[PDB]
Design an enzyme around this catalytic site. Sequence first.
Site, mmCIF file in Angstrom:
data_model
loop_
_atom_site.group_PDB
_atom_site.id
_atom_site.type_symbol
_atom_site.label_atom_id
_atom_site.label_comp_id
_atom_site.label_asym_id
_atom_site.label_seq_id
_atom_site.Cartn_x
_atom_site.Cartn_y
_atom_site.Cartn_z
ATOM 1 N N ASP A 7 31.970 27.622 52.119
ATOM 2 C CA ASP A 7 31.558 27.787 50.735
ATOM 3 C C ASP A 7 31.005 26.468 50.209
ATOM 4 O OD1 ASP A 7 31.077 28.597 48.176
ATOM 5 O OD2 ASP A 7 33.137 29.181 47.708
ATOM 6 N N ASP A 32 34.454 30.744 57.642
ATOM 7 C CA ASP A 32 33.938 30.902 56.292
ATOM 8 C C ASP A 32 33.607 29.524 55.741
ATOM 9 O OD1 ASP A 32 33.233 31.567 53.728
ATOM 10 O OD2 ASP A 32 35.195 32.348 53.140
ATOM 11 N N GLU A 79 43.451 46.544 61.334
ATOM 12 C CA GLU A 79 43.851 46.638 59.935
ATOM 13 C C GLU A 79 42.635 46.610 59.015
ATOM 14 O OE1 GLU A 79 46.130 43.285 58.594
ATOM 15 O OE2 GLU A 79 46.779 44.285 56.753
#
Lengths: 336, 428
Positions: free
Chosen positions: A76, A74, A28
């Site tokens: 941050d 991920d 996708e």
Amino acid sequence: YKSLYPFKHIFNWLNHSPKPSRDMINREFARYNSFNSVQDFKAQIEKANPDRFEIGAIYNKPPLKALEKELVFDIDMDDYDAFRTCCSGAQVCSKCWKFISLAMKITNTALREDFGYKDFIWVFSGRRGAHCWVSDKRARALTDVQRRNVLDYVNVIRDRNTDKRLALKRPYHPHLARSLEQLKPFFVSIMLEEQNPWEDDQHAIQTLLPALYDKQLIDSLKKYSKEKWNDIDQIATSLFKGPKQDSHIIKLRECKEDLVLMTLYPKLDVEVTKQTIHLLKAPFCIHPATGNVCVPIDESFAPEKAPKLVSLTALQPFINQFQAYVSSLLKNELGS
Amino acid sequence: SSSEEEKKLYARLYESKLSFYDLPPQGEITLEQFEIWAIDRLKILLEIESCLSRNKSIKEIETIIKPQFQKLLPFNTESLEDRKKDYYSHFILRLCFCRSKELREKFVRAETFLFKIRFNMLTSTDQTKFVQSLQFISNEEKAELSHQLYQTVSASLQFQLNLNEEHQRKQYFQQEKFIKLPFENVIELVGNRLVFLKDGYAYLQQLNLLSNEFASKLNQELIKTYQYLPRLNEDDRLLPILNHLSSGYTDEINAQSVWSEEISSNYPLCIKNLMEGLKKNHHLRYYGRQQLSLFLKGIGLSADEALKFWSEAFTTMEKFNKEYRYSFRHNYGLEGNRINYKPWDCHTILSKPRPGRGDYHGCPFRDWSHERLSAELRSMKLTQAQIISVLDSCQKGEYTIACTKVFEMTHHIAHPNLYFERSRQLQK
Ligand code: SF4
């Protein structure tokens, strides 16, 4: 998209074969887009002209059940915000970049000495973060439950509130001991000196006091970063006399270790990791707000090093880094 | 097989007091020991599930199943009769519960609980002896990885072997072995950091791994047993046995609600006819009252809402308090010897004397005509061939199969309460 994005390298990375495969036909692109070759990849990206396109899972059908997608992480800086003074808001520099460097070091140590994974690289998030892509065969087809297991193994910091004592399980799990014996020497030089967030008395009472167990010692220190760090031990030895000094000293050691972890431990993203279906910004995408290139991260990389929006441009070294990684990934795929 | 061959076979297969019960049996058994052994093992299973449903803890479960071990199913006693007893009983159970997925789930869970209790029951030597006969890491790999495994397993040893002292933990950790397996098989222990991992290999909390391996193999074997059921179904000596053993394991609903379609949509025919009679005549006779009352208790109506509904349906209060209040409270066990009378089943309801004029109790697949039954089935939007099937089931004296028939077509049951339970479960 016409000139600088290296479509061939990304296609060969995500195809898991020199020849186009269902690993690329049935993946996708963000929703629910897929390409069959490098040429159609380039044509569709150029025609759509997106700010950024996100990588989906490999499916059984051309984008619907998810078959494979590389394990991702991920991170941050937001979860580390209460502990810096070099930058404010959404600014970045090599002083706050040490946080992501230490976190990536810890996570890579875990993934290699622990999980048997070998083909993992880090992708800069564009502004302040780093994205992990583990492309080994085992992680790509990793189930949702086992992805939850690996995440819950990696993220010890489950409570992101800085005003509470963590009260971690004792004695440490071996990975915890390894992470602390890794991060402890760096903790002084970064947090006590370069950032120095506890020099401010209000930030001190908000952050360094709640991490302690004893209310009496908390109040004594309150009435009374390196200096405060030493004063904690001094007033602890001053207030705790008798045969019960030993337990208090040990638990003070453990609380200090918990706070060092809370400050410098990996605070990942918990939702990009869980489900294989989830999406993440593809490498070499452009951040619409800053204009940087989401370049692959090596050990010495700093935010200022990322080029701003070809073989003689600054993009080329990152292109060759990705080339080497993809070649190693393909040879490991042949080995598997 | 001659008694010597079977003797050697069970010596080999029960060299350890414990086994995952892998292979089919070898021998012949007279049906009486078939029943005795099946009943013993099933009763122990029922008691263990009763203990877990109330959230009893591990040691009390051990203590409470200890006497049933000492009486019903002897353990750790070398009698070969005990061994073949246990083995045959287990595989008969595998015949029993393999019929439905709910039953398979419960059987796998409960037999794995038996595995758990037996395991914690055994001795250390025999524990490891079962574990031996899935790779034990070498003593060199143990010594090289000594500190990490000690760090990992120390907390588990503290909480599970009451090893408060550190020296005892070191002594037993020296004795302990370690297994190496990829973490995809022990991810549950990985999540809690109960086992050390290294380069994609988990060092195993080994009891949980043994138990869940046993449980999965049990589930697969049980599915296979269901697959092969028709090849034994010619055994006319066991189908009654397996049916008996299968059945051996067997406010929102408020006074105003029981008249609402959301509540009575799940009813069987008997309760629907009883509601119809109670609405029409504003009175039933003793059998209908008892059937309906115990049914409505079984579905979960409170005593006060029960008084409310029953009093409402009679559109005087004086005669109520005089004659019916005491009987209704006696029904809920709230009077007399304090016996909360379990609801009548389809069997007990059929055991009641046949209904007459003014009666509505019984099993309507019996007490009605094929004319009324068929008209009611047509009102239930059933096809023609479905009607022939239901009436064929009825004509053979088989009312319960007609009931479960109409269930499966409007959505083995010989209990209206479990009829309602499955019907509600289909919506949940
Ligand atoms: S067979 Fe039993 S459950 Fe079914 S309607 Fe008759 S009495 Fe009720």
